[PDB]
Amino acid sequence: AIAPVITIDGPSGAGKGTLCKAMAEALQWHLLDSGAIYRVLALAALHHHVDVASEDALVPLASHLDVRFVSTNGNLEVILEGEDVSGEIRTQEVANAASQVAAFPRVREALLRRQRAFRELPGLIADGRDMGTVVFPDAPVKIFLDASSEERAHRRMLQLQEKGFSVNFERLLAEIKERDDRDRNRAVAPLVPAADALVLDSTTLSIEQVIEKALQYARQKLA
Ligand SMILES: Nc1ccn([C@H]2C[C@H](O)[C@@H](COP(=O)(O)O)O2)c(=O)n1
Numbered sequence: 717a718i719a720p721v722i723t724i725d726g727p728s729g730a731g732k733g734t735l736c737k738a739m740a741e742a743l744q745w746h747l748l749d750s751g752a753i754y755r756v757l758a759l760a761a762l763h764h765h766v767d768v769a770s771e772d773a774l775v776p777l778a779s780h781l782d783v784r785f786v787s788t789n790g791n792l793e794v795i796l797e798g799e800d801v802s803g804e805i806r807t808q809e810v811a812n813a814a815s816q817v818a819a820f821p822r823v824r825e826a827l828l829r830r831q832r833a834f835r836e837l838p839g840l841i842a843d844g845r846d847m848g849t850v851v852f853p854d855a856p857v858k859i860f861l862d863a864s865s866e867e868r869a870h871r872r873m874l875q876l877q878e879k880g881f882s883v884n885f886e887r888l889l890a891e892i893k894e895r896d897d898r899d900r901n902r903a904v905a906p907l908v909p910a911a912d913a914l915v916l917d918s919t920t921l922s923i924e925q926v927i928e929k930a931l932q933y934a935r936q937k938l939a
Pocket of ligand 1: 751754
C-alpha cells in the first residue's frame with residue numbers, strides 16, 4: 717500500500733516498455749508490464765477454449781489465471797501455467813485478443829488485485845493504459861508518454877523490418893488506430909491521461925531524450 721509508484725500510460729507502440737525498463741534500471745525499482753497480463757489472459761482463453769467475446773466466460777479465467785513474471789535479466793520473461801510464453805504473447809493476434817478481453821469491466825476488476833500487488837518497496841514503475849487513472853490513483857509520479865499515430869506506426873514498421881517481417885504502412889496505421897480507439901472509447905477505465913500526468917510527446921525526441929526528461933521529472937517530484 718505505502719510505497720512510491722511511477723505510472724507510465726499511453727497508446728500502443730509509444731515506447732512505454734523501453735522507458736519503463738530504463739527507469740527501473742536507473743532507480744533499481746520493480747517493474748510491471750500491465751499489458752503483458754492482459755496479453756497472457758488472452759493467450760489462456762485461446763488455449764483453454766474460452767470465448768474472447770464472453771465476459772461471463774472470461775471472468776473465471778481472469779481470477780484464477782496462473783501467471784508469473786521474472787526479473788528483467790536484460791529482458792522480460794512471461795510465464796503462463798509454468799511455461800515461458802514471452803514470445804507468443806508478442807504477436808498481433810494475442811495483441812488483438814488482449815484488447816477484446818480488456819474491454820469487459822468485470823474482467824479488469826478481477827485483475828485489479830494482481831496488478832496492485834506489484835506495489836512494493838523501494839518502488840515500482842507501472843506500464844499500462846490506466847495505471848495513473850485507475851490502478852494506482854495516488855501515484856506521486858504520473859507520465860503520459862505519447863506521439864502521433866503516424867510516427868508510432870513508422871517506428872513499428874521499422875522494427876518489423878529489422879527482424880525481417882514484411883510490412884505495409886497503411887495497414888499498420890489502421891492496426892494501432894483501431895487498438896487505441898477501443899482502449900479510448902471503453903466506458904470503463906479507458907485510455908486518458910491523469911489530470912496531474914505529465915504529457916510526454918516523443919514524436920521528435922530520441923529514445924535518450926525521452927528517458928532524460930522522464931527521469932528529470934521523476935527525480936524532481938520524488939526528491
Ligand atoms: N493497463 C492496461 C494495459 C493494456 N490494456 C489492454 C489494451 C491494450 O490494447 C492491450 C495490450 O497492451 P500492451 O500493448 O501495452 O501490451 O491490453 C489495458 O486495457 N490496460
